[PDB]
């Protein structure tokens, strides 16, 4: 009965590790199912109202997109959004940033990162009037150095769109918005 209790405890522990491991491959599947290797990210954010309130309450200040790539063995990148805004746009804007991540093939890639980047929030209404902003990475910003940690400092647009505009336009629909990032891949190994 002490031996029976010990093996029951040993199985319960292994069952918990499996439950963690299973949950963690669920996330891995969702990352793989939304990967993109042509330098264009489409990011779907569901539950706007709830997640916006989470950012206002300070529960969750920012959200990260899934990674996307310039090629099958190129730069790894993602997007960062602050629904309640960051910096000079806190409380009044939605802020949107580009993030260089540590890639497995960094030792083969040009540094600093010098590719043109366009940040967009999509119009879901018939006009297709997408808000957009392109920029040429400043070769001296630490945001574009060869990554040393998992993520470089994000860089982008603190005052990308005012919240009043966003919420009065056709950008939200079924409590969902869409963010698009386009990195230009024309001047690189193909």
């Amino acid at each position: 009965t002490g031996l029976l209790e010990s093996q029951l405890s040993r199985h319960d522990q292994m069952l918990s590790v499996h439950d963690i491991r299973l949950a963690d491959m669920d996330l891995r599947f969702q990352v793989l199912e939304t990967a993109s290797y042509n330098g264009v990210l489409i990011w779907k954010i569901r539950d706007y109202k709830r997640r916006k309130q989470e950012a206002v309450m300070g529960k969750t200040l920012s959200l990260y997109s899934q990674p996307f790539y310039t090629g099958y063995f190129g730069y790894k990148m993602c997007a960062r959004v602050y629904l309640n805004g960051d910096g000079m746009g806190k409380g009044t804007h939605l802020s949107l940033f580009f993030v260089i991540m540590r890639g497995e093939y960094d030792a083969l890639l040009p540094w600093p990162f010098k590719q043109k980047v366009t940040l967009m929030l999509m119009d879901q209404g018939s006009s297709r009037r997408h808000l957009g902003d392109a920029f040429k990475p400043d070769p001296n910003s630490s945001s574009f150095k060869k990554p040393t940690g998992e993520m470089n400092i994000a860089s982008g647009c603190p005052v990308f769109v005012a919240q009043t505009v966003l919420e009065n336009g056709t950008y939200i629909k079924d409590d969902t918005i869409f963010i698009k990032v386009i990195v230009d891949t024309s001047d690189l190994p193909d």
Partner: peptide, 5 residues
């Protein structure tokens, strides 16, 4: 291009 806080 500003950085995040």
């Amino acid at each position: 291009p500003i950085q995040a806080s």
